[model samples]
Target chain A: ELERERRFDMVVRVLARNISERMYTFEHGLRGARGAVIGAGSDVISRDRFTRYSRSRDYPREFPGVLGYGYIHRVAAADEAAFLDAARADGAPDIQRRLLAPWDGERFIVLYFEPESSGNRPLGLDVASEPRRRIAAIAAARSGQPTMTSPVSLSGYQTPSEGGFLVLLPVYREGMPLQTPQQRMDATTGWAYAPLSVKQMLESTLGDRDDVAISLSDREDTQHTFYRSGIAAPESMRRAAHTQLLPIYGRTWVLTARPT
Target chain B: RRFDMVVRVLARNISERMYTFEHGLRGARGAVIGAGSDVISRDRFTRYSRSRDYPREFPGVLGYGYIHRVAAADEAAFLDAARADGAPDIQRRLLAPWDGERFIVLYFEPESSGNRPLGLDVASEPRRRIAAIAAARSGQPTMTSPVSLSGYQTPSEGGFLVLLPVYREGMPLQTPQQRMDATTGWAYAPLSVKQMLESTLGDRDDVAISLSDREDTQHTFYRSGIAAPESMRRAAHTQLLPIYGRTWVLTARPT
Candidate 1:
């Protein structure tokens, strides 16, 4: 009887550890990319030049769970036409904003530079068009920290059905005062962000632990779950449950564990 | 006197069982120390534990893990830091309150087939604390006499714990004061009496085994199999095993 209890405890501990290690790895990868962006003086570089440098580094290819890294250049309402023209000159002839509503904000976040891959399809998409991504980008810009968004469907993916999350690391102009949120928005040059597949992130981190189930959500009630693994026990009682709060840049994610 | 020969056989079997238990703990110590800083991080430790080829590599062992030496004043701070570092359920209240300056807290133990032994304090209990203090003083691997661990199903089955006191690297261990000052924590393994005996001796239907703590002198710590007949008990063979500066009296007789 004692042995039986000991084995059960081992299973739970293993599952929890697996979750925490993966989360740490993910955070490490993001910080590495953020450092690279800062080192390159991304605020002063051309979008094309920065994109080339980012591709040369190829962080997404090296790190598991990262779909791709790209830049979201913040363009003022007055410079919208100039921004589109510049993108066109740089070979993005189809660059344009795809806002969910009529553009009314003083500035827009344009997906300026990503890897020239069919899967990315990020050229010319306005990030501020989506409510979830906008909130995360604004938070990152305000806090000067990496911020994660609630899970949302990617717009221009080759497989449009897959859900994904975004991590926005704000790039601010050197010597700019960013004490307030508005000041951050005004001084923000662009964002170095990564689009990550929620399913792939969970799989790469959690692996195949058949005895345990994990659920990751942006909220405590688990209504806005981004990824789930192992057997779904909607009706059955959880034998044991562990919840962990993860700080991603300035954002928060709730990771929950239960015996399957 | 008819069962006198059987008593000798039972004594030998018990001796071999104790030897195996000791051997298993020594191996566990090697594994724990080899892990380095992983034992300090619960996430890393659990990952390392799961990676081990248990039962095949560490046969007849339950599980092995770390126990941290936390100052009484820092207990709340330690608990808060642990919770912030991804363990939300960690608590200081799980351990018994000790008015002493420091507490030996059960910080981590990998689950095998049983309940998780988290937040247990070996140094708070009378019998276990004696062995812990001895190990801390000697800076050597030491064993405790059979005792039931708290927070398990009660009345708990008798078990023993072998603790290897871990000290800071580069710390001098020449004196008792130096050893106490440099002591970091402990790496320990627990063994159940029934499991240890069954794993080492197989079926022992013809004999009974009993254990007593010489320090306490009154209570029997463990009893196994059939009760010995009165005549056989008089001729019981006894072995004195030194455990953590104390002595455990092991006696065996034919049923």
Candidate 2:
């Protein structure tokens, strides 16, 4: 066990591979409170029928943008009763009809998230309001590809010490050919995104392996680190630690690993 | 309220994207500084200018372009190509008699125009000079009003340029004079008003969007959708979009 403990390089590789795979393909299923779109031949569900079927968690939904190798949506946990209700008139309406509103190209809102629980994210939270998120979001929309934001302190983290960042993918409408930047934005319906917590990822991958101490920092600004595991010992004993660079999405991140 | 809402949302979408594109120009200038600004390495510039990272990096643009500082001694061979192409107007402008200094375009990316802008003195054009001088003084990303460029097959209107000053790596840039002294040339990007608007509000026909340069309010560069009703026009949503070092008036009214 002592010999294995000295092998910090092995731990770094394992952690790097695990983190990459986890982010590349998350576990599964993006569920929500709104049941199905409640239609026999169609995909949209009625307002009353939506909450009625919200009780069922078995149905995994995917946003229309990522249907090829993707997931779906349920009732988002935002304050959107007004928006959902705005689609129809207050008086008598079709009982079995689904209610939908026009898309807000300006404001970006969260529809649903995976694992059923997203910390500090309100149902109608507009991510584009923040300058850090807006630049990446706009770029993603224009490019019609995955783009990453610089290191950001994601809201609702239990430990403020842990740093986080989001990878955004523009979700365009189905059946539109996105050739130029113009075509991409014209087809944009919304976005599919994932917020990565460096510490959370490290905790799972590193587990009880105290053999290695690692730190991950964004190259954009190295003043702060996203995650750091274990503590550094005196530099005299271990004169060197292995360091590597990762091009995650659009941003390049630096990882340094040393024996504890 | 619904009509009012779309106008407001569309207006904001356009404004934010412009600001984001401006940020790209600022960052591009830093890359030039990092790769030996005074040395002016063409190899380094070609990679940065041609990278696919743009379109998203700079958002909506033709591509990155460079305006190089050509000292008087090297002006002859630089303008030789233009003279050979039989472009008298272009040759006349660029054929400075070993003058003090000239800001010439060393290259432009995507090769869309066969590098027609190559060797053209950017400072010779009245409009481009306005933006070039502004960037040199402020050490900031500055924009020009609507102007025609070299690469266009025909007369292309509504296209404009944004430029950022490239300064010596170790030189002081705190003051305008310091910036002008250290500045070698500019890192530039060309943008089109039509493509920019179409990307944001193209799919929608329910709203009308119009934009004009604030400095010359009479000249509108873009017009989309049908005119709005008088009542709707009176209540239209309007915003002042400040981009780089320029200001634009954007208004959205009901279709």
Report fnat for all candidates as fractions from 0 to 1. 0.00, 0.00
lDDT of each: 0.61, 0.56
TM for chain B in all models? 0.79, 0.81
Model 2: per-residue Cα lDDT over A1-260, one tens digit each: 45644576576677677666555443122112211331311333333454344333332233111111111122232523443354234221321111111222355654434333433322334565456676777788788667768866554232211245666776556578899988887766555566665545455455665555566777876644555544333231224567777765667778777654
Model 1 interface CAPRI class = incorrect
Residues A135-229, candidate 1: write the lDDT tens digits.
88888888877787876666454321346777887778878898898898778877777777666666675665655555666662354355554
Provide interface RMSD per model, one decimal: 32.7, 24.2
TM-scores of chain A, one for each prediction: 0.80, 0.63
lDDT, candidate 2, B137-202, per-residue tens: 987788898664434322222468889888777889888989888878788887776666656665
Best candidate (score: TM-score): 1
CA displacement after TM-score superposition, residue A101 of candidate 2 (Å) = 30
TM-score of candidate 1 chain A against the true chain A = 0.80
Indicate the DockQ of the complex predicted as candidate 2. 0.01
